[PDB]
Amino acid sequence: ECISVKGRIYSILKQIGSGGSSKVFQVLNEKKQIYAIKYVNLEEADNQTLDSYRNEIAYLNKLQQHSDKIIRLYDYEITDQYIYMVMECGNIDLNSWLKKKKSIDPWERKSYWKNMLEAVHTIHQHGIVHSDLKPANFLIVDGMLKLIDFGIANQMSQVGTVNYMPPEAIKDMKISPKSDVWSLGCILYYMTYGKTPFQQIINQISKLHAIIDPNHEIEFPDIPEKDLQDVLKCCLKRDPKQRISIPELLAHPYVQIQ
Ligand SMILES: Clc1ccc2c(NCC3CC3)ncnc2c1
């Protein structure tokens, strides 16, 4: 089984990415170099959907040259019927790795955090707020985290967590770069304490109520890394104005010292 993209033939090893109008394949070029090919079927896509797809592709292509913490787009083919994207394969996505992980090495966690800040800072610098950050949006490649997507794509049953959702998004029923800081904060909180801040709340309506409720205090059990603890408290402030920024996070002792 094979796919051609801009003349070049790729043999398929397996399917990574599953279901929807979109599939991801692990593939090899004729020199046996490994890649991921993202395949999108465009037959049922309206113009607004199409426009979001072209817009994410254009941004991914542009911002590549600005950080190596953003996934590599090598090439693509795009017609009225389909998109093929030839991309960096990597080793494993962050969520699948975290699921099979007993505990995280403090050094690795700090390193992943640095990568995540770098990727997200980069998109913010070009006017993009992701607004839907989770572990699955990060790919581990040679012990480096890379951002897989920018959250621009429009649309593609018991999945789609609200665990990383910021309070101002829920009260808004504005989104800003601080919204990404919250979700990053929930990812780091999960890498620190083994769960996300509101993961205990069974009912989703209740969960959303806890997220926005000032009287609902998030717990920050004492840990050896006091700087890590402070990062979490700064990221998980409900008021976006008082929430720490990415530039402030990049100067934080947690990422700078030792
Ligand atoms: Cl676009 C893209 C590229 C690679 C992905 C990936 N790679 C890890 C799979 C073991 C090969 N895992 C999950 N999603 C991916 C998405």
UniProtKB/Swiss-Prot annotation:
Provide GO CC annotations from the record: cytoplasm; kinetochore; membrane; nucleus; spindle
Q: In which tissues is it expressed?
A: Present in rapidly proliferating cell lines.
| Catalytic residue list | 132 (proton acceptor)
- Report whether NAD shows up as a keyword of the record: no
Q: What is the effect of changing residue 149 to A?
A: Loss of kinase activity
State if Repeat is listed as a keyword: no
- Gene Ontology molecular function: ATP binding; identical protein binding; kinetochore binding; protein serine kinase activity; protein serine/threonine kinase activity; protein serine/threonine/tyrosine kinase activity; protein tyrosine kinase activity
Alphabetized UniProt keyword annotations? Acetylation, ATP-binding, Kinase, Nucleotide-binding, Phosphoprotein, Serine/threonine-protein kinase, Transferase, Tyrosine-protein kinase
An example Gene Ontology biological process = protein localization to meiotic spindle midzone
Instruction: Tell me which residues make up the Protein kinase domain.
Output: 10-255
Binding-site list for ATP = 16-24, 38
| Protein's job | Involved in mitotic spindle assembly checkpoint signaling, a process that delays anaphase until chromosomes are bioriented on the spindle, and in the repair of incorrect mitotic kinetochore-spindle microtubule attachments. Phosphorylates MAD1L1 to promote the mitotic spindle assembly checkpoint. Phosphorylates CDCA8/Borealin leading to enhanced AURKB activity at the kinetochore. Phosphorylates SKA3 at 'Ser-34' leading to dissociation of the SKA complex from microtubules and destabilization of microtubule-kinetochore attachments. Phosphorylates KNL1, KNTC1 and autophosphorylates.
Record's subunit section: Interacts with TPR; the interactions occurs in a microtubule-independent manner. Interacts with MAD1L1 and MAD2L1.
Per the record, the similarity remark reads: Belongs to the protein kinase superfamily. Ser/Thr protein kinase family.
**What protein name applies here?**
Dual specificity protein kinase TTK
